[PDB]
Structure 1
């Protein structure tokens, strides 16, 4: 945290990543359409696997 020389002065930071899982087994034709049509907030990342 100092610009020049002091070595025992320090800061410690962390980032946390949260994770969730959902699975659907017997769908219909319209459910996949709705799910691919949906929209989400800015800071959420979503992945769909068939």
Structure 2
């Protein structure tokens, strides 16, 4: 089983990882290493004056962070627990068999 973790904060994500790679160890299973992935950086430019003045801008950004964790030898026990976990708000997870 693979779970991909994704979020806007980096401290926040490096929690959920540690949380999951604690349970996986708990409910007897081998977890194949939290491996980080390229972080997408959507960028935006906007006129900051409400009229005229083209050369006056802000440059905004959203950094998305991706993490991947595997499940080597999925115990029957684990599959329920790693499914049943209330996980920090503002974090998307995608467990997929």
Q: Do they fold alike, i.e. is TM over 0.5?
A: yes
Structure 1 or 2: more strand by fraction: 2
Aligned length: 50
- Output the CA distance in 1 between the equivalents of 2:87 and 2:74: 21
Gaps of 5+ in 1: none
TM-score (norm 2): 0.49
Runs of 4+ residues over 6 Å off in structure 1: none
TM-score (norm 1): 0.90
Larger Rg belongs to: 1
- The one of the two structures with greater contact order (alpha-carbon pairs below 8 A, sep at least 6) is 2
Gaps of 5+ in 2: 1-47
